[PDB]
Design a protein around this ligand. Structure first.
Ligand SMILES: COc1cc2c(cc1Cc1ccccc1)cc(NCc1c(COP(=O)(O)O)cnc(C)c1O)c(=O)n2O
Ligand SMILES: COc1cc2c(cc1Cc1ccccc1)cc(NCc1c(COP(=O)(O)O)cnc(C)c1O)c(=O)n2O
Lengths: 428, 428
């Protein structure tokens, strides 16, 4: 594979820090080595000295004097080595990528710690997109990806979706406007990638099947496009065995996968990870190096100490307690919507995630009902407009989150909504 | 002032999160309000429960159950409100900007917390630069800004400098190729900004005087460019007492100032702040929103609790303790270089910062002496090549850091260096 067509002139021009290069000779050398190279501060000047963090069902994490100096100090752009080896290990355990032992240039598996999955996704789009480029996704999509894409000046082509996510025949229909050989020609302007959330799509909650994923991968191989697998709900799947990922089937080294610890470990710590082909992961690390330098060494050390003590087993037991809480929350929003919304609205049961996508029966645009009327009543929800490329277009949909609300709060929220849905249909 | 000439088409196209827009109506605000809007996970599912951090000359920072849930949760893109009000307060105390009460559109003072000063600088260059644009800078410069600038495709105009920083007559000579009216014509390609490190420039250690700064500001006003004042050594000045900043004199609202806590509080926590005109700070916040979302809530809470308990007095007692340590380190590298390098090399005494810029007497390029010969001897330093736009150009300079090395390490380093210099002068 040739990654050069997937990287901008700006991204290709990125160079490794000539400072880190000299600094890395220090880490590969003996204790007798003297360095006057790095601009690392003296950590003894830092005011925080020790840290003791308690863990619910787990050993208390302690940062002694030395560990604290390391945690308060600079670290590599890709991430701390202990977090990197544990995450690569996990990707192999879970997804067993075929690329593990490929040569670097051919797209060997590489991983980098990002400041949330959002940072990885952002740096990938900025790496790939030139203004006017064609890009594939299924609308409704995650707003953060729509807000990243909009300033990039690309052409978003919508791929049809149902309850089983992206319809492969819709993808086959869009792709048919180009020839498989048109991928090799830049001027023919073939799509650079396919963006998708294969588990509990934000905001629908729909998941792709194994069969659909295989049809999508064969199409990515045929029209030589990348698959941006943004999977933050891979660990939040409801009443399902884990369907293989696009990374698990990545024989070509054409999948960039974004994983998030935001729903399972911490949203505020800003720790996510990006898995993909080494030439592309490298371009992302070089952009991180000039922006954030590296993710918080402190937060990485907090997560790495927890993760290492749990094991890939203790981690999974934790994922299971998290799914349990979110299933009970989904059951509660579903009970509330059954009680108040049946006959007034339509919704599919989410497969993964923390959102219910509700279609209002007799209203074309729920924008004023949700932004004006519902707000004035003290009930907040999201209008469907926020999850489309054209936000000016009317939407009969709303997104309801079930993460934090108590059953009794959901009951009050939906009664207000049914009352507001009725006050909108009762106008003769 | 018109900021639209300092904002690219991609930066202007950035929109605030429609999600977050709803999320802020909840903050304003009765307790009776129910939200099903945000995708905020339930923080009771996070495994870390409490934190106890000990402080050097200060109260033990304790994160109770509620504080920990907030610290592990998402927060605003610009930063946590307590850190923001304390930093704005400090900027007023220290710099007293004239823009404090200007209307937003006219460039009112705004501040945002960034993931190090590097993130702020990066997002500012990306906000301003279009390929082929002219930018003013004094070489040698900080490598990280050279590696951010290189992929942006701009033209870096070298402004000459001496021991008192940038020579204002050199800037006056460069600018004379345009007319003050040329800033109104985009096609006349007038420089968009002047980038400066006014205290202890990386790698020289030279500081601008008050008089030079006033001549530079009047030239910035005349040719209507911005001043990107990257001041990470403002709190690390030796035997000087702090010269007024470009922000202190910013009557026009044309200064973007980057401050760093990397040398005073923590390099690894990735917490810095950007102060500048509200329309420009706003464009930076919108880029942060789509990349890192926000800086670590946890790290911000650590810093904010320390800073609020210290006050602007205890913060100051700390920066003076930090200067004290670096002062002694500077006397030690200076003692070592006096002992071994006199007659073999030339150097100026740094005014601020943690680096000594050494010029080797009879060598044109110290690249092989430092990268091959010094490395093989176990002594690491940086070749001068790393701090120039054209790195292929030979440099007789090296950068020696005095942050961490002990006096006895400096002695051994400078002896190796002198012996390597002597051996290199014997090659005809
Ligand atoms: C109320 O505010 C929020 C609403 C949010 C989210 C975050 C905030 C907090 C926040 C603070 C400051 C500025 C803006 C936002 C995140 C969402 N989803 C996370 C997500 C990510 C990023 O995840 P990562 O960067 O945390 O790894 C990547 N891909 C997919 C498919 C995702 O679904 C979401 O749906 N809503 O509605
Ligand atoms: C050995 O590695 C380092 C060498 C470093 C620095 C950091 C690292 C750590 C690192 C880890 C991962 C990737 C790359 C680097 C920072 C330097 N200066 C900080 C600085 C900043 C950024 O400061 P901020 O982002 O921390 O606020 C802005 N402006 C000016 C004028 C500065 O002088 C420097 O001189 N050296 O040589």
């Amino acid at each position: 594979m040739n990654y050069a067509r997937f990287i901008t002139a700006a991204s290709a021009a990125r160079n490794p820090s000539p400072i880190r290069t000299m600094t890395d000779i220090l880490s590969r050398g003996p204790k007798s080595m003297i360095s006057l190279a790095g601009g690392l501060p003296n950590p003894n000047m830092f005011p925080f000295k020790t840290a003791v963090i308690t863990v619910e069902n787990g050993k208390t994490i302690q940062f002694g004097e030395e560990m604290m100096k390391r945690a308060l100090q600079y670290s590599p752009s890709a991430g701390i080595p202990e977090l990197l080896s544990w995450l690569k290990q996990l990707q192999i355990k879970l997804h067993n990528p075929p690329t593990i032992h490929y040569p670097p240039s051919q797209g060997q598996m590489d991983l980098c710690v990002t400041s949330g999955s959002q940072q990885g996704l952002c740096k990938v789009f900025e790496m790939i997109i030139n203004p006017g480029d064609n890009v594939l996704l299924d609308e409704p999509a995650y707003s953060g990806t729509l807000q990243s894409l909009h300033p990039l000046g690309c052409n978003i082509i919508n791929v049809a979706s149902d309850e089983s996510g992206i319809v492969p025949d819709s993808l086959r229909d869009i792709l048919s406007r180009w020839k498989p050989e048109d991928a090799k020609n830049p001027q023919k302007n073939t799509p650079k990638f396919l963006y998708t959330v294969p588990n509990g799509n934000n905001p629908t909650g729909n998941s792709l099947t194994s069969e659909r994923k295989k049809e999508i991968y064969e199409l990515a191989r045929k029209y030589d496009f990348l698959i941006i697998e943004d999977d933050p709900y891979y660990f939040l799947q409801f009443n399902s065995g884990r369907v293989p990922t696009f990374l698990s089937m990545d024989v070509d080294g054409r999948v960039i996968r974004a994983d998030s610890f935001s729903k399972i470990i911490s949203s505020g710590l800003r720790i996510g990870f990006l898995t993909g082909p080494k030439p592309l992961i490298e371009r992302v690390i070089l952009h991180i190096q000039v922006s954030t330098l590296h993710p918080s060494t402190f937060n990485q050390l907090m997560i790495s100490q927890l993760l290492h003590e749990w094991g890939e087993e203790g981690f999974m037991a934790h994922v299971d307690r998290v799914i349990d809480f979110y299933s009970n929350q989904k059951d509660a929003i579903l009970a509330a919507a059954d009680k108040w919304l049946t006959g007034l609205a339509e919704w599919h049961v989410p497969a993964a995630g923390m959102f219910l996508w509700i279609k209002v029966k007799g209203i074309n645009d729920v924008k004023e009902l949700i932004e004006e009327k519902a707000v004035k009543m003290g009930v907040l929800m999201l209008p469907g407009n926020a999850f489309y490329v054209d936000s000016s277009a009317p939407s009969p949909y709303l997104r309801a989150s079930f993460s934090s609300a108590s059953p009794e709060q959901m009951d009050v929220a939906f009664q207000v909504l049914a009352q507001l849905i009725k006050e909108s249909l009762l106008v003769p």
